[PDB]
Amino acid sequence: DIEIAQAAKMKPVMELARGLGIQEDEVELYGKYKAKISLDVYRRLKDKPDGKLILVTAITPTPAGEGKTTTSVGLTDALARLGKRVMVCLREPSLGPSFGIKGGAAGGGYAQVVPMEDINLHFTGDIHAVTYAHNLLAAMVDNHLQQGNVLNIDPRTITWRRVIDLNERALRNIVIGLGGKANGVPRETGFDISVASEVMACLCLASDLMDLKERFSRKVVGYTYDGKPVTAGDLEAQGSMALLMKDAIKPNLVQTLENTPAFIHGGPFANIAHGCNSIIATKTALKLADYVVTEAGFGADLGAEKFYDVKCRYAGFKPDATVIVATVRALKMHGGVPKSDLATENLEALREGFANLEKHIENIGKFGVPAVVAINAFPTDTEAELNLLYELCAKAGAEVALSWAKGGEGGLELARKVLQTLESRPSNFHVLYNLDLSIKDKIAKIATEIYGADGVNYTAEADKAIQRYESLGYGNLPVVMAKTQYSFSDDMTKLGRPRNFTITVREVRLSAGGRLIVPITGAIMTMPGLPKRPAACNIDIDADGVITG
Amino acid sequence: IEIAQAAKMKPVMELARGLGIQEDEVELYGKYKAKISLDVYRRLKDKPDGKLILVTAITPTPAGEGKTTTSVGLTDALARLGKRVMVCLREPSLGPSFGIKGGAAGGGYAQVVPMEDINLHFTGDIHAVTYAHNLLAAMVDNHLQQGNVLNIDPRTITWRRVIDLNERALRNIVIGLGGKANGVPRETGFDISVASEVMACLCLASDLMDLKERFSRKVVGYTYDGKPVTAGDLEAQGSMALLMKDAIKPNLVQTLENTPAFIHGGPFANIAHGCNSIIATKTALKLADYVVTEAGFGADLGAEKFYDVKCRYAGFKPDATVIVATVRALKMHGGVPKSDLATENLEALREGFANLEKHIENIGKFGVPAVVAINAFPTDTEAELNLLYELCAKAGAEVALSWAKGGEGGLELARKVLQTLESRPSNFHVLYNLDLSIKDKIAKIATEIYGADGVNYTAEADKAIQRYESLGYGNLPVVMAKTQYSFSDDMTKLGRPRNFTITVREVRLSAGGRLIVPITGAIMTMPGLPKRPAACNIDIDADGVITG
Amino acid sequence: IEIAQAAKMKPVMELARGLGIQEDEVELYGKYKAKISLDVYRRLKDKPDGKLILVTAITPTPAGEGKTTTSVGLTDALARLGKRVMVCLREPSLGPSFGIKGGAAGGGYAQVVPMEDINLHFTGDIHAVTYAHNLLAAMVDNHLQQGNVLNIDPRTITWRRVIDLNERALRNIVIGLGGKANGVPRETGFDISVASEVMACLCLASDLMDLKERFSRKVVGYTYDGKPVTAGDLEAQGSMALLMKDAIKPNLVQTLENTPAFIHGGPFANIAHGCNSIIATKTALKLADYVVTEAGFGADLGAEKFYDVKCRYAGFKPDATVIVATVRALKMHGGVPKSDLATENLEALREGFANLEKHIENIGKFGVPAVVAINAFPTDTEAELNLLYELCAKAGAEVALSWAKGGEGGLELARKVLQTLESRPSNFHVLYNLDLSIKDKIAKIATEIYGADGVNYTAEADKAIQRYESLGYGNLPVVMAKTQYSFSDDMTKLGRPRNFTITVREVRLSAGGRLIVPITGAIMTMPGLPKRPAACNIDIDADGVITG
């Protein structure tokens, strides 16, 4: 009953891989409870049909929390108890947070994927592969300048920054190549958290290694003194980068507290990227299982949208259903109630905050997939409140979840409601926008139809970038909005369902290993810092076990 | 090609068994690489250790040492003689792979495997070091940002950062730019990961709780009052320890002749001692009759620090010591041009021998028996070898073809080591004492070993040493950070230079270990990529790698 | 060529005499340039001042204003009518000379001299500012180096450095590198010298003791607690004052028509008020019946700050105000292309007139009489002029050829100014009050003058203003740092834009004066050299200069 104190009985992953149809020679162990699986499992099982794909997302996140991954693990466990063949595909957490604000569980309570400690730490070294693949390219960029700059790159135009998996403000802005002609070419850069690396996004969206290698070659690192693009491909570094990702390309098999098979592979930001786990895990899971549960970072206005418009578009997936998690509290915060009085009953605030959930329902509906609401049960909630929220959910199926404090058992209702909609409401999935539209038409389609905004404004900088990109041939790519996750708008104070507002993009970046990144506010916290009181200052490993993780 | 030497390995779990390791004391990383719990040792704490065979070599030359190969090729041969032996080598840096290419983990049929893994991520040992080092750094910079409670002077901070790639651009940099929200501007830099004091501590730690405490002693800088502020004062030893939880365990792999091969650690040899970890060798000791391990650079640096630092702390007492050398090698010390190592020249071979001979004596100075080894090379003529044979008139000597014959080309030398390890009982002792003065320690290492008539200390060195000894780090060991291509600090003085001197220009302190006194610019703690990098050539087929 | 206009000057000492200045109140810098003691004023403190003729102009355009010329050409004409008048202009930055060439200190036969000196070192006024600014900076950095007794946060320091050259490279830099002995690393930069708050203070100071105290109020940054640390807290006002001992005195020179010409000061017009010093004009006042002075940019910026800042502090009460404008100028505001200002177009001339007319009204808003001026240009046809003549249906209007006729082409306009200065008695008042809110001040300047329906303040602006007013600098004047090519912040909106808004993005504080609220990127406080600089062409013969 704290989540870490819940280290208990796991079954060898080989056992799990065998009972899933994976041959022993496609399993590479990392201890008895972790394994990477060959992309051969999908290569030979590709002509078989896919199981059902269930995306779990949530309402606009608030400081009161909602418990998104907890529901994903619990739902999966519930489908398992109900006898369904099922797996969960989740993202690998960044190492950094483990030392700043303490590492959390892959879920919570009795709804989590273990081994916990390993997953919050080095796990199987995937992030390390990204870190070095990404940094090798930076070093090849700087060595190429040092070597005479044949490609004639303007160092001052280099956008490929460096990366590292810890929270360090100090590396945000820095100057490299100092010391004299023997120590490189002086320039300004900095570091981003590793999981923010475009490399981490390439992994999450690649078909396999060769695809991963090609996407790498397409990565722009800077421009010539003429404005012409310069790619890693131009520096002949994709092969080497691919080599570093040799093993990281394989999804990792772990399990739930109740032994339900699970894939954890990849884990990118959800503002500067799509916030989804890899495609190679999900598609492998769709073959090995009849039901696959996966999730997406931030609320449905970002994660769900990008899961649909980016991950599924590339992979060919066609979501069968989507579950949206909400709590009475988080909802009452969208209704005006302060974090301090969230325990006190307030049907009016609950009814007004519902407006937020109501908007996500409708939105999910614009993609052709039926939605199901998952109420993450909380002690202080009252019957009057839950009951109000249940009937308000007049549009889709609603079921309460007690997966946190009851494991799969607390999610049987939700499981049965999902199965119920999977049988009578087949989906008709379709992305939100055609790729042939203008970059601004995509931005507007998303801002208009999903956020509920009136329109979009652009700064001079944003306009120049959109034109340079479009004439440079990157205007037909998908669009990944980098905005605040705490509101449908770009103003994190406007909770609930803000109306009559405008979205403003001030800068537009490019990830040639995917698409366009237009950010609004300071969504550029690409490198979180450490608190005055670093969880690390308390961390200590006993003569045997750990403590304070 | 050496890589082509990808042929038949064996499930390490088996070896772990055919050694006496409980299954519950093994964690796999595939079926051909695995770690071993520190429980193996603690329980077999009283069991009788085996013998120790510290392989070493002459003074390196652009001709070919043979240090590493001969270390495995000997293990093959030894165990090929129905003996219980392992190999405790060092894990190579990841960087060289994409710059000048990755090499064999030995040589010919004496290379430990799997090769590729070893030259890349392996079991992620280096990454672990990389993050324990960088988190400390992040804690240092975030501390300033909070209010500098410890009143640190950013400008004095010695704790750099780390990455395991060859990047010159990161040698000198300016961090903390941006404003009151992005930290405090200061000058730092990056060093290759395997140069980390964290790698050192790892390679010189008993058990986590040990490695931890060592971390807590590391100095990251000073306050404005000249007062040292350690990692311990930052409360970072715990977290640093946790990141190492796995890396602390040694990695069990094997030879091409399925001989148990232990690969754990990989520090620098100049700024450090260039030895594989202790927890590893002290383990192989329990699990084997004989343990064949090596050290970086020539015996004048590695062996010396191996005896004075590793064996000192660990409690080891080396029973033997093999020193490698080729014909071409010594010849260069005889003035033989690199493009002139093809032709015969017994006169030079004899002159250069002084190199080989000089080491022979230093070895003997550690009350540890000694034995010569000769990497058989195609050009070396009968005449040459014949001469060199008798030249070693002072201690055991055997030729070795462990390169193109595997454990076979090693039988000869193999018998000699046993023969002498059975008849030549050592009384191992440290070449100097831990209470002597830093200078007197440097001296004893300089005179008796390097052969310097004396030592010089610049104004900088003096101020530092006085600070240190006045701070408390005076009773510590000494790691000579100097050129390796010469007994002296002059990399041009080949052979056995005489009537020379040694000048210590700088002096760095390593709380988690000892004292580093550098001579010349041995500060190349971050090598750089060439104009024709291997990264530009490395590729990975829809199946396998081709160019690494 | 205008430079060729090097012909007959007169020993300023004489002029100083033919004005009533005691010889002991003049310090020469050759026989054609000299300073005047601040004693002239203090003694003639009660003597009756003369009249004030603040020349100004429309909204600048890439066609040709005529601001400066018409200011001297008028003085010639005025004094050419047996009147006691001087000219109080501004000293130009040294930088433009080596980048885009140095220009006339007026125009045609209305340029003050000696030209060369004026565009170079002159009497070293700027150098003096340059060093009082930089010494403060050095005192700030040396303070940190000592122990930061005032607990300053280097990262907050707003006090930049200064140089009087166009150097982009110095806009953003990192200083204090090197170690505990070379200062504290921080991010600063350089601004052109004439952008210095020191230049401002100079151009807005009564007497040394005044200028001094002002210096002591300047804010160089804040402590870690957000507490302001001024130059006064650094005890730098004294030294800063001494470096200015000479620069405080105004410089007496002359026109081509030997009319007394005062050139002292030269601040920025956007980040500052663009007016020659006060101590100067308040001097020429005593020593003359009429004083002809000007202000930078169009009347929407210069005149406004001239009235609200200069006249406010000094106590002046402008009796007149001339606003210049050419035919081609207004036409561009009518949409007339630059390469299309050759042909006639009365329809555009009429439309663009809105520009001219809009100013006319703002002028009148300061209870100060107004009068139009037209720089006669070769292409302007009779038709065009004829139209523009009557278009000014609201206040006095006269054509001027002070360019190619000297004080002659100015007679016409000259009479009109007297005619109206004699019949049109002003009741000069500030357009706003010193107790209003910063926003309400910005507003009143934005509405009544700029013509903005309102003003917007970003998150940054708001936080700043609140800080300031919460710090005590709320009852201060406001200097609109915005584009000058448009009444609005949009440099493309020519003419008299309507139904627009103004958005203050940033807000800088100038303790030694007022508050600067910038709109667009008017932060070009350090212009840069072109690819074809005049420096590459300037030369000096074994006799004279050729290319400057």
Coordinates of C-alpha atoms in Angstrom, one line a residue, chain A residues 14 24 27-32 34 43 95 99 117-118 121-122 125 127-129 131-132 135-136 138-140 142-143 146-147 162-179 182-184 188 191 194 209-210 213 235-237 239-247 529-544 546, chain B residues 13 23 26-31 94 98 116-117 120-121 124 126-128 130-131 134-135 137-139 141-142 145-146 161-179 181-184 190 193 208-209 212 234-246 528-531 533-543 545 548:
Chain A
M14 CA 10.4 -16.4 -21.6
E24 CA 12.9 -18.9 -28.0
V27 CA 13.9 -13.8 -27.2
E28 CA 17.0 -12.1 -25.8
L29 CA 17.0 -12.0 -22.1
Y30 CA 18.1 -9.2 -19.7
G31 CA 17.7 -11.0 -16.4
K32 CA 14.8 -13.4 -15.9
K34 CA 13.0 -8.6 -19.1
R43 CA 7.8 -10.2 -40.0
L95 CA 15.8 8.6 -16.1
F99 CA 16.4 12.2 -9.3
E117 CA 12.9 0.0 -10.4
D118 CA 14.5 -1.2 -13.6
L121 CA 16.4 3.5 -14.2
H122 CA 18.5 2.0 -17.0
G125 CA 19.5 0.7 -22.3
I127 CA 17.5 5.7 -23.9
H128 CA 21.3 5.3 -23.8
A129 CA 21.3 4.2 -27.4
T131 CA 21.7 9.4 -26.3
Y132 CA 24.7 8.2 -28.1
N135 CA 25.4 12.7 -29.7
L136 CA 27.5 10.9 -32.3
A138 CA 26.5 16.2 -33.1
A139 CA 30.1 15.3 -32.8
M140 CA 30.2 14.5 -36.5
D142 CA 31.5 19.6 -35.1
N143 CA 34.3 17.4 -36.4
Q146 CA 36.8 21.4 -37.6
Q147 CA 37.9 19.4 -40.7
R162 CA 23.1 17.8 -27.9
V163 CA 21.3 15.5 -25.5
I164 CA 21.5 13.9 -22.0
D165 CA 18.9 12.0 -19.8
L166 CA 19.1 14.2 -16.6
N167 CA 17.4 17.4 -15.5
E168 CA 20.1 20.1 -16.0
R169 CA 19.3 23.7 -16.5
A170 CA 22.9 24.6 -16.8
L171 CA 23.2 22.8 -20.2
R172 CA 20.3 24.7 -21.8
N173 CA 22.5 27.5 -23.3
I174 CA 26.2 26.9 -23.8
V175 CA 29.2 27.7 -26.0
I176 CA 31.2 24.9 -27.6
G177 CA 34.5 24.6 -29.4
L178 CA 36.7 26.9 -27.4
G179 CA 40.4 26.7 -26.7
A182 CA 43.0 22.6 -32.2
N183 CA 39.8 22.5 -30.2
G184 CA 37.0 22.9 -32.7
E188 CA 26.4 28.3 -29.3
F191 CA 21.5 20.1 -24.3
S194 CA 17.3 12.7 -24.1
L209 CA 16.0 -0.6 -38.5
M210 CA 16.4 0.2 -42.2
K213 CA 18.3 4.4 -40.8
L235 CA 27.4 13.7 -43.3
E236 CA 27.1 10.0 -44.0
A237 CA 26.2 9.2 -40.4
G239 CA 24.7 3.9 -40.7
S240 CA 26.6 4.5 -37.5
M241 CA 23.5 5.9 -35.8
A242 CA 21.6 2.8 -36.9
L243 CA 24.4 0.7 -35.5
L244 CA 23.9 2.3 -32.1
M245 CA 20.2 1.5 -32.2
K246 CA 20.7 -2.1 -33.2
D247 CA 19.2 -3.5 -30.0
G529 CA 15.8 21.5 -14.2
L530 CA 16.2 20.2 -10.7
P531 CA 14.2 21.4 -7.6
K532 CA 15.9 23.1 -4.7
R533 CA 15.2 19.9 -2.9
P534 CA 16.5 17.2 -5.4
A535 CA 14.9 13.8 -4.7
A536 CA 18.5 12.6 -5.3
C537 CA 19.8 14.3 -2.2
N538 CA 17.7 11.8 -0.3
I539 CA 18.3 8.8 -2.5
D540 CA 20.5 6.1 -1.0
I541 CA 21.0 2.4 -1.6
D542 CA 21.2 0.3 1.5
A543 CA 23.7 -2.5 2.0
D544 CA 21.1 -4.4 0.0
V546 CA 17.2 0.9 -2.4
Chain B
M13 CA 25.2 -19.8 -17.8
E23 CA 22.0 -19.8 -10.9
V26 CA 23.8 -14.8 -12.6
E27 CA 21.9 -12.2 -14.7
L28 CA 22.0 -12.7 -18.4
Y29 CA 22.4 -10.1 -21.2
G30 CA 21.6 -12.6 -24.0
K31 CA 22.9 -16.2 -23.8
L94 CA 32.9 3.2 -27.2
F98 CA 33.5 5.5 -34.9
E116 CA 31.0 -6.4 -31.4
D117 CA 29.0 -6.2 -28.1
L120 CA 29.7 -1.0 -28.3
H121 CA 27.1 -0.9 -25.5
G124 CA 26.0 -0.8 -20.4
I126 CA 30.2 2.7 -19.2
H127 CA 26.8 4.3 -19.6
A128 CA 26.2 3.8 -15.9
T130 CA 28.5 8.3 -17.6
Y131 CA 25.3 9.1 -15.7
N134 CA 26.9 13.7 -15.0
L135 CA 24.3 13.6 -12.2
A137 CA 27.8 17.6 -12.2
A138 CA 24.1 18.5 -12.5
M139 CA 23.8 18.5 -8.7
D141 CA 25.3 23.4 -11.0
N142 CA 21.8 23.2 -9.6
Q145 CA 21.4 28.0 -8.9
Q146 CA 19.6 27.5 -5.6
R161 CA 31.3 16.4 -17.3
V162 CA 31.5 13.2 -19.3
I163 CA 30.5 11.5 -22.6
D164 CA 31.9 8.4 -24.2
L165 CA 32.6 9.8 -27.7
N166 CA 35.6 11.5 -29.3
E167 CA 34.5 15.1 -29.4
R168 CA 37.1 17.9 -29.4
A169 CA 34.3 20.5 -29.5
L170 CA 33.4 19.5 -25.9
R171 CA 36.9 20.0 -24.4
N172 CA 36.4 23.7 -23.5
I173 CA 33.0 25.2 -23.2
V174 CA 30.8 27.8 -21.4
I175 CA 27.8 26.6 -19.6
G176 CA 25.0 28.2 -17.5
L177 CA 24.3 30.9 -20.1
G178 CA 20.8 32.4 -20.5
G179 CA 19.9 34.2 -17.3
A181 CA 16.6 31.1 -14.8
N182 CA 19.2 29.0 -16.7
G183 CA 22.0 28.6 -14.1
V184 CA 25.3 30.3 -13.4
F190 CA 33.9 17.1 -21.2
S193 CA 33.8 8.7 -20.0
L208 CA 28.6 -0.9 -3.5
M209 CA 28.7 0.5 0.0
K212 CA 29.4 4.7 -2.6
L234 CA 26.2 17.5 -1.8
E235 CA 24.6 14.3 -0.7
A236 CA 25.1 12.7 -4.1
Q237 CA 26.8 9.4 -3.1
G238 CA 23.5 7.6 -2.7
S239 CA 22.0 8.5 -6.1
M240 CA 25.4 7.9 -7.7
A241 CA 25.5 4.5 -6.1
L242 CA 22.1 3.5 -7.4
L243 CA 23.0 4.3 -11.0
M244 CA 25.9 1.8 -10.5
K245 CA 23.8 -1.0 -8.9
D246 CA 24.3 -3.2 -12.0
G528 CA 39.2 13.8 -31.3
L529 CA 37.7 12.3 -34.5
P530 CA 40.0 12.2 -37.6
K531 CA 39.1 13.8 -41.0
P533 CA 36.2 8.8 -39.4
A534 CA 35.1 5.2 -39.4
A535 CA 31.6 6.5 -38.5
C536 CA 31.4 7.8 -42.1
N537 CA 32.0 4.3 -43.3
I538 CA 30.2 2.1 -40.7
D539 CA 26.9 0.6 -42.0
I540 CA 24.4 -2.0 -40.9
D541 CA 22.9 -4.3 -43.6
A542 CA 19.3 -5.4 -43.6
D543 CA 21.1 -8.2 -41.6
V545 CA 27.3 -4.7 -39.6
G548 CA 33.0 -1.3 -37.7

